[PDB]
């Protein structure tokens, strides 16, 4: 089936002991190595396994911090969730070529570039949009990220 937002909450409420283990990781396949991860993800979850890549990416992104990624519900007026490009653009901390490099990145490199971007950004966004794009992470999603960023940064000017 599909992965809930309950993962986000579960990440929020888990103890610092485990979270320190997960936060302490350079790349996602290294996330695969440690136990607290399997313990975290067992419900959602391992071993479908069609989900596993998505879960590695999602947890790896969440791993940035307790409140690095903040979840904001779609406003009734907008009826669209604020999305990662818009968020990174909104924060104002992020420089666009570091996103261009994100678009250019490949496999393990892309997530690592990304995790680095959020911590510096401390973004607010609709978590399942990030989940949805992270689940596929096709070229279309990559491109949409940049489009969103440029457009909102231009609107914000």
């Amino acid at each position: 089936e599909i992965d809930a937002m309950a993962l986000y909450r579960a990440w929020q409420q888990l103890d610092n002991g485990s979270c320190a283990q997960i936060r302490r990781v350079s790349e996602p396949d290294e996330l695969r190595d440690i136990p607290a991860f399997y313990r975290l993800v067992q419900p959602f979850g391992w071993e479908n396994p069609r989900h596993q890549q998505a879960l590695l990416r999602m947890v790896f992104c969440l791993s940035a911090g307790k409140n690095v990624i903040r979840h904001q519900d779609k406003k009734s007026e907008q009826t669209t969730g604020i999305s990662l490009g818009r968020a990174l653009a909104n924060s104002g901390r992020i420089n666009e070529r570091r996103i261009f490099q994100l678009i250019r990145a490949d496999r393990t490199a892309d997530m690592v570039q990304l995790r680095r971007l959020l911590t510096h950004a401390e973004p607010v966004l609709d978590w399942p949009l990030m989940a949805r794009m992270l689940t596929w992470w096709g070229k279309r999603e990559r491109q949409q990220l940049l489009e969103d960023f440029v457009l909102t940064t231009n609107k914000n000017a």
């Binding site: 996103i99 678009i103 491109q143 940049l146 489009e147 440029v150 457009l151 231009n154 000017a157």
Partner: protein
């Protein structure tokens, strides 16, 4: 022409081509429709027929109009009374002869290719076209060439002139089930006839061949008159000696006499332009200042539906509005509650050289007489969605100077317009053929939705190969923005 027996036709349901005199056409129940190898010449033919029919038989009452349509306008005697005119000879008389001038024989000689519009206009013609269409020509196949050249074609430049509507003027004719009905349906009732060219007192009703063009620099103008204008042929050419019994190069048929050349010379004159032609619409433009009147001509490669509004919708200044052709204007008054079947054709030109030729049959259902505003709407819609795509891709290519975005830059709008136009040709004429004008704006909405989807898809398609470079993925953000900024102003309803 009347006695001459020159007209080529085929019966409606099944046929072998036959050659005819104006008499049997006007006096018959048989359903005939025109038949030639080329459509532009068919249009020229029918324009000739409508011109002469208009000249000989223009009169009230509207009842007579309808009656002439449904019941043939002559027992032989009734028509035979109708032709006093003996201007249609090109037997030839030394005095008149032939819808062109005589004398002024200035060798050397020129083949008949030049009068057939399409061929030998340009270089690619010599390359891409079949040879030997100009060897031999006939009474009909030639007369049609001459009229067509005088009115609907712009040849030959170089101190020659094209009159009177202009060069590349477009025609608009109402069509009926049979040639007979058709030729009449575009004739102007004596009062409708009287309204447009009544002034009369400075009349000349004498053709260029009966009475000649007044030499040079004249001026006078606006006193052309009912007849002398419609058969105005300024080519100033003496058609060469006829020959032979053999096939027309293009009539395709055996003929008793044939023509293998013509003789030409330079004639100059100039006229103040306000001459009201029943056959074509004209467009009224104001700047600054003094008004600008000229006749509709095809200017671009665009689909014909784009022109529709100009063809069947009258307008008044200063909105700046067009004026529809008189024949159409008449037809709408005489038979409301009847659908139109318009036929329109014309050329695209540079100098001698013909670039595109369009001949069309356009369909409308009932309401077009009343609230043809709806008709104007669909055109402006279809164009409104086009210009959105074009502007978006122009921005994608040239780019936004501020705030410092760099553009692609390749010309993508140009190739996308063609796709749009091609796929639009399917959807816009087709609806406009079948709309219940009375209560049909949901149809327009589904149209806007389809055009919307088309613009989205073409925009994405045209940009797709270049959008792998963040350099340009940034520009298409703004470009896509302009696209939807443009698309939003159109759709909601």
């Amino acid at each position: 022409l009347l006695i001459d027996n020159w007209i080529p036709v085929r019966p409606r349901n099944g046929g072998k081509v036959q050659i005819i005199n104006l008499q049997s056409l006007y006096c018959s129940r048989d359903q005939w429709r025109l038949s030639l190898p080329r459509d532009d010449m068919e249009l020229a033919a029918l324009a000739l027929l409508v011109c002469i029919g208009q000249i000989i038989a223009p009169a009230k009452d509207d009842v007579e109009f309808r009656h002439r349509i449904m019941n043939p306008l002559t027992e032989d005697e009734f028509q035979q009374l109708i032709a006093p005119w003996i201007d249609m000879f090109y037997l030839n008389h030394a005095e008149h002869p032939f819808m062109q001038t005589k004398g002024v024989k200035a060798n050397d000689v020129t083949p008949m290719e030049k009068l057939l519009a399409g061929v030998s206009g340009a270089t690619n013609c010599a390359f891409v076209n079949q040879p030997g269409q100009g060897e031999a020509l006939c009474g009909g196949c030639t007369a049609i060439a001459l009229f067509n050249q005088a009115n609907q074609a712009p040849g030959f430049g170089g101190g020659f002139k094209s009159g009177l509507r202009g060069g590349t003027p477009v025609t608009t004719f109402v069509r009926g089930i049979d040639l007979r009905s058709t030729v009449l349906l575009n004739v102007l009732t004596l009062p409708r006839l009287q309204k447009q060219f009544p002034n009369e007192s400075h009349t000349e009703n004498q053709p260029t061949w009966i009475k000649p063009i007044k030499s040079n620099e004249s001026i006078p103008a606006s006193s052309i008159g009912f007849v002398r204008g419609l058969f105005w042929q300024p080519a100033h050419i003496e058609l060469c000696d006829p020959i032979g019994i053999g096939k027309c190069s293009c009539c395709g048929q055996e003929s008793n006499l044939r023509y293998t050349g013509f003789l030409k010379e330079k004639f100059t004159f100039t006229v103040n332009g306000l001459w009201p032609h029943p056959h074509s619409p004209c467009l009224v433009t104001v700047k600054k200042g003094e008004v600008e009147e000229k006749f509709l001509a095809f200017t671009t490669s665009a689909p014909s539906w784009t022109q529709i509004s100009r063809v069947v919708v009258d307008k008044i200044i200063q909105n700046n509005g067009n004026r529809v052709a008189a024949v159409v204007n008449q037809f709408r008054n005489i038979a409301p509650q009847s659908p139109l079947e318009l036929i329109m054709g014309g050329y695209r030109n540079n100098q001698a050289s013909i670039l595109e030729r369009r001949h069309d049959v356009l369909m409308f259902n009932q309401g077009w007489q009343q609230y043809g505003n709806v008709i104007n709407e669909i055109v402006t819609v279809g164009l409104g969605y086009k210009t959105a795509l074009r502007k978006a891709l122009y921005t994608f290519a040239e780019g936004f100077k501020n705030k410092d975005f760099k553009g692609a830059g390749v010309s993508v709008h140009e190739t996308a317009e063609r796709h749009f136009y091609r796929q639009s040709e399917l959807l816009i004429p087709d609806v406009l053929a079948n709309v219940n004008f009375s209560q049909a704006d949901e149809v327009i909405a589904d149209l806007r939705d389809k055009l919307h989807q088309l613009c989205e898809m073409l925009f994405n398609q045209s940009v797709a190969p270049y959008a792998h470079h963040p350099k340009l993925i940034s520009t298409l953000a703004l470009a896509r923005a302009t696209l939807y900024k443009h698309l939003r102003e159109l759709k909601p309803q």
